[PDB]
Ligand binder design. Structure first.
Ligand SMILES: CCCCCCCCCCCCCC(=O)SCCNC(=O)CCNC(=O)[C@H](O)C(C)(C)COP(=O)(O)OP(=O)(O)OC[C@H]1O[C@@H](n2cnc3c(N)ncnc32)[C@H](O)[C@@H]1OP(=O)(O)O
Ligand SMILES: CCCCCCCCCCCCCC(=O)SCCNC(=O)CCNC(=O)[C@H](O)C(C)(C)COP(=O)(O)OP(=O)(O)OC[C@H]1O[C@@H](n2cnc3c(N)ncnc32)[C@H](O)[C@@H]1OP(=O)(O)O
Ligand SMILES: CCCCCCCCCCCCCC(=O)SCCNC(=O)CCNC(=O)[C@H](O)C(C)(C)COP(=O)(O)OP(=O)(O)OC[C@H]1O[C@@H](n2cnc3c(N)ncnc32)[C@H](O)[C@@H]1OP(=O)(O)O
Ligand SMILES: CCCCCCCCCCCCCC(=O)SCCNC(=O)CCNC(=O)[C@H](O)C(C)(C)COP(=O)(O)OP(=O)(O)OC[C@H]1O[C@@H](n2cnc3c(N)ncnc32)[C@H](O)[C@@H]1OP(=O)(O)O
Ligand SMILES: [Mg+2]
Ligand SMILES: [Mg+2]
Ligand SMILES: [Mg+2]
Ligand SMILES: [Mg+2]
Lengths: 382, 382, 382, 382
């Protein structure tokens, strides 16, 4: 395999062994001032997501052209409020909301985004950006617009003095620092069968599988309750200490912990365990991300919840995650999705998670370091 | 001499000679969510400098209560445009424009500011903040208000995940990382004598004193011209490479170079040297800060120029700085002020600079490192 | 949730943390002299309520356009004599009876009122106004006339040197200082069910319902009698001492105590307990505010009594409120209404009150302070 | 000296040096409902000053019995229009115009008045009353009628929830908060000498006297003009900011500013300085109070001007007061009177003011605070 674009980028080559730690190329001290040229009839446009009309344009572009499963049956349906939460964390910059519009009709046909993040990678803590929501309109595919978007966001991030990024993709590029598998836990088995998300278990029937995937009516961990403002410091402390055991992690400020974990309905849910002494010992969190059910006339929305960051110091992780499934069922989700990073593998069997198709690859840009097992990835991206 | 406040802070003790490099205390896992309590009748306020009224409140407070000369006869005249330049560089945050108001009147009586900066100190580059414009109304002096302002800005910076700061002061605190002296160069001698900035020397008549300091009407260096947008990258590259030879320097992004150096009338002046080949090989910069005569506040200002960053690779430093003086005299400045950091000592005598009273002390908060000579200090602060 | 008008006003933002106590903005030392511009065809007019024709006009506007229940079945029917009581307390001003007329037909289509009140809020006592009776004609709804009325009364109150205000609303605005719930006590349960104010309970008959809510035919408390002029000082004394335990209360002069509590038939009823020693140790009070029953051929009005201020020092509060119910029943009221402020929650169950829909939000204008539970609200609005 | 009445009142004793701040006794929560008993044959009557017959009775009482001059050869000549201005400011109450009448004849023989005012005293602002025009018929003197008047107006003010007062007197009572002296400026010195208000000074002629006190015929400050309706906001702003430097001051609403300063001929004169930019930067004001002369060599009345509030921010105070004298002379005044409060002492010498007999003592009722110098008194009483 030959990568026309990625062979020119500061990333390790696919089959290369990596025994060192450090950047691929030195920091630049002079940056290209002019935006990269787009094909004729297209123009750059930084999207003001505070303008609800422009936010709806981005919602529409992603709702119609963003990530689909392998079988092309489901597509992510990021709500506009979710996109606001994901794209305006502390330190966001308007130029890093990088759209492409056709000049004649002003139609949004491309996008890519960067948000700042302090990243712990092995023994180094570096200021980086997280790249997400790279999208090219279906009617512009395979014309190498995606390399222009990547080079442009690189340029605009370089202008701010940042020379490394982290990103995830379902495809293999040079070169994954980690590779993870998807796991799903059924909550509404019938809907998952009728929409062909899962198939009837072999040597089983419909209402056999239902009471097999049944769970309690309310969680079992004593002291569980939704996160409040008074919990921001301890949630920050619990997260920082928990994440030290992994090799690729975010390093969040207390302001970033508030942004990413303070509950917002139909966006992010965080529950803390406050024990008999009044101490917050653990917390669980998951975010709301439905998928559009394509070419299906009856059921059109698949309501999914995604495991976010789950920290345990006193409640066993099995108890914590069981309660997360229970809370997700109570809130009307159809499935609970996660990736096998951190300690997520440890409760797959007992909590009856099923393995999904594909792989999630983790990448660093302009950083060369030995790869790591999925259990050492401690970074969850949206 | 003991420091009731500073002895409690993460800084080296005076007299403690330091040979190590690192933080004094760890980054904080959890941060006080509540602002520190002010004396009764006062409250915090994050000033929105984008509001014309609030901005005028700030320069009123500063022009009436900020730093005066050791003589107590010259109040600096801070303009709103200058304050937006100094207080809103890339990365500025509203919560870091920390004001103190009387609760009932909302009268502004205190201020302290933080701006983010990437700082290189010996072998380590770290994101810090620069603390400036600490000001307490003259009717509230000597009543412990300054330690509360310092702790509150410390708290607000901690909340963003930053645990180091750099600051300067004319007073000795635990513990200076560097000590610098002030130097001034008369441009318009007769006005400085009339105002009593400089007095009549021994056997020195003023019929010939306009001779001692007179300068060419035009600069010697051929390719000298004002900095333009097209120069932003090369000025960024020149500055970054020049600063590597010092031990305490900023690390500016290209966006930060544009903000700090792109010329703004009566604020910041930058001239690049473009040689016979079209290459920019040097540049000089100075910022504008006039002073009102405390005895004659209704009279016109004392126009002062302050040396900023001067980089040479092809023009001799002596030539660049001489042209700096000539350009300042051309623009109507009465005096050119500088601090003996970087290589500024090398042209003091030849260019007829005179020493000033007092010392400029440089400090790091929560970073223990050996002290350095003025000539290794490569950071200029407003 | 974005408020086009309220986000411009000196009130805290919804969901903001409030640590402080004080004004949002300073007292204004120059006030807009010109009334705010109304839509074409409409004019301001200060209503002289001492003129019976104009009083009738305001009565008509409110009787047809003021507050309805959330099912549009009942509308407040403030009497003219009630309106004089509520709008001409000590210190009233004619410019604060602010109406809007149609220029051609002189028809009253809008109103808003201010009355002065000294307000105790936490550890501060401020001269404020109470804003009430904001009303826009049904045919003029949703045309942004309310923001003009609010800004104009704000201007007219500013002219008299008052810069804080207290008000209640059934809708959620930025930002409630307290939230309370409505409770009712059936007195004529047959009529209440016949007009669908109440519904028949769980498998219970009409005959069982009527005797569940039966009341004694005379009050129980020994010494209960209507308030007389001689009681004004002790009622003033009882109220002042009792209100000290709450966090938001009025501070009434003795002249204000006479206005608000001296009995006026069909307006305000106050009963004191004069014990066997001849001293007044308690008092209860309720005002008369019926509701129009919309589109009913037989029942035209819902005669309702509203709990006002009830002070107990020797008679148990439970006993006082029971006699309030008995007295209201004797007087022919259909229902006894209250808000769960002060200690009202303590007798909801014992005395068989039933919960109402919606909430009553309490707001302060240009005053930032922590919110409070309903039991610390000690201020009753008309 | 024993003060039979004042020793019973909540005021500091003379010789008691006070250096705390606050009320002498707490607010009362029950107030005497019945008027105090007068000597047999006398009754209380609240004077309706909107009745021209009753207004005529009051100025008859005052013109014949109120404050005599320092030579008791003149009588003040209070017009009905002056008294309306002094006694009906914003917030006036009819019960605070407190008269005493003979029962059988209804003859008015006593008076005392309260008007409301917000008062800034050191670091406290409080709603107070100003007491003035205490007058007892000459044939009723020394019968202790004045203490009953004072107790009765205290009671009527307590009934409205106000527990502090400010007042002035020529006599020493417990306990002056500040002491000022009277100054006067001859404008028509020949008339003053002929009516024995002045005596021709040491060894001079009338010609030399009239030359000594001669004034320009037109004011020096160009842009001086009468106050107009459009100036009400800026005059309010100027006054509020200027008065902050003094320790005892009124806090006027914009409505109060209009009442006290808007010109009424033969009552109050206000002139503003509108500079070359159209900005109003200063104002001067004086009120009219003539004195009838009890003798005629010719000359029935003495036209006296009294300095009111003079605010300077651009015009030097010397020039502003010089222009006030010129304006008073132009309008036919014979003398310009003032008290050495605020900055008035600073132009006594240059503008040729002379000292008058007696002193003006300032008092607070039920408020303890340190005394102040005359130049810190910022309150002018009629
Ligand atoms: C210091 C600052 C650095 C900041 C930048 C750091 C790097 C950030 C990198 C981006 C992180 C994104 C993180 C996320 O958002 S991952 C989510 C990506 N979005 C989707 O999957 C949505 C649906 N798909 C599309 O909209 C388009 O098909 C996309 C835009 C994916 C490709 O458009 P198109 O189908 O029209 O293709 P092309 O002809 O234009 O281009 C073909 C070239 O593109 C390489 N390609 C294909 N898919 C990806 C992919 N997901 N990451 C990186 N490269 C990808 C491919 O190997 C080939 O290069 P090479 O084989 O010739 O070498
Ligand atoms: C990780 C985030 C960290 C962020 C914070 C990093 C540290 C930032 C540190 C501040 C960087 C400022 C950078 C600039 O802007 S330097 C310019 C400072 N401003 C002026 O000189 C303006 C005119 N002066 C004033 O307004 C007042 O005199 C000030 C406000 C300076 C002091 O008010 P006042 O005279 O009423 O005093 P106090 O009774 O309240 O307090 C006495 C205590 O204050 C300590 N003091 C006096 N002057 C300074 C000074 N320049 N830096 C640090 N500390 C100072 C003093 O040693 C004593 O502590 P200790 O002797 O008892 O121990
Ligand atoms: C220093 C002195 C300050 C003095 C002023 C202190 C503040 C006084 C504040 C008033 C205290 C009143 C105390 C009482 O009397 S509460 C009783 C209010 N009256 C009624 O409920 C009677 C029936 N309703 C009506 O007549 C109208 O629907 C009213 C007049 C309520 C609104 O007219 P309309 O339906 O045609 O709407 P619009 O298109 O003109 O305007 C919509 C805007 O108005 C905001 N809105 C809606 N309802 C209220 C409400 N009850 N308080 C404050 N704001 C309210 C709304 O959020 C939106 O603003 P934003 O969402 O764009 O931000
Ligand atoms: C919270 C609400 C509080 C409101 C009230 C605040 C207090 C307001 C207080 C009033 C502020 C007034 C502000 C102005 O208007 S000052 C202008 C006063 N008026 C005149 O000078 C007009 C001509 N004089 C008279 O009409 C009478 O001589 C007056 C009425 C002055 C006294 O009548 P008379 O000569 O027949 O005497 P008496 O036997 O009835 O009574 C003798 C008692 O009166 C004490 N005396 C003498 N002169 C004054 C005086 N100017 N303030 C206070 N007390 C005064 C005296 O020390 C003795 O008390 P004590 O030595 O036994 O203790
Ligand atoms: Mg393409
Ligand atoms: Mg202080
Ligand atoms: Mg409307
Ligand atoms: Mg008497």
């Amino acid at each position: 395999r030959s990568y026309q674009f990625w062979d020119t980028q500061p990333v390790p080559k696919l089959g290369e062994v990596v025994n060192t730690h450090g950047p691929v190329e030195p920091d630049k001290d002079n940056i290209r001032q002019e935006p990269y040229t787009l094909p004729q009839g297209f123009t750059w446009d930084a999207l003001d997501l505070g303008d609800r009309g422009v936010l709806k344009e981005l919602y529409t572009l992603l709702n119609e052209n963003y990530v689909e499963d392998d079988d092309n049956m489901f597509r992510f349906d990021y709500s506009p409020e979710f996109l606001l939460w994901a794209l305006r964390p502390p330190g966001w910059l308007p130029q890093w909301h990088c759209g492409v519009r056709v000049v004649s009709s002003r139609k949004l046909v491309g996008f890519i985004s960067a948000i700042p993040a302090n990243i712990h990678i092995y023994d180094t803590e570096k200021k980086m950006v997280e790249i997400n929501f790279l999208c090219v309109h279906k009617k512009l595919r395979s014309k190498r617009v995606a390399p222009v978007l990547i080079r442009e966001i690189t340029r605009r991030v370089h202008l701010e003095g940042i020379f490394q990024a982290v990103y995830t993709a379902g495809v293999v590029l040079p070169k994954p620092v980690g590779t993870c598998q998807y796991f799903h836990r059924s909550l509404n088995p019938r809907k998952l069968i009728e929409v062909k998300f899962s198939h009837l278990s072999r040597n089983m029937t419909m209402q056999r599988t239902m009471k097999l995937y049944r769970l309690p009516e309310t969680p079992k961990t004593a002291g569980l309750r939704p996160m409040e403002t008074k919990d921001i410091p301890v949630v920050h402390q619990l997260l920082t200490r928990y994440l030290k055991q992994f090799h690729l992690t975010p390093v969040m400020s207390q302001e970033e912990v508030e942004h990413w974990f303070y509950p917002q309905e139909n966006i992010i849910d965080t529950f803390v365990v406050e024990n008999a002494n009044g101490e917050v010992t653990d917390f669980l969190s998951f975010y709301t991300l439905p998928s559009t059910i394509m070419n299906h006339p009856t059921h059109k929305s698949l309501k999914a919840a995604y495991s976010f960051y789950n920290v345990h110091t006193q409640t066993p992780l099995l108890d914590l995650m069981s309660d997360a499934l229970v809370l997700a069922k109570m809130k009307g989700f159809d499935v609970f999705n996660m990736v096998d990073l951190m300690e997520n593998k440890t409760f797959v069997e007992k909590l009856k998670f099923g393995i999904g198709d594909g792989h999630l690859q983790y990448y660093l840009y302009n950083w060369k370091c030995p790869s790591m097992g999925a259990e050492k990835v401690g970074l969850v991206m949206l």
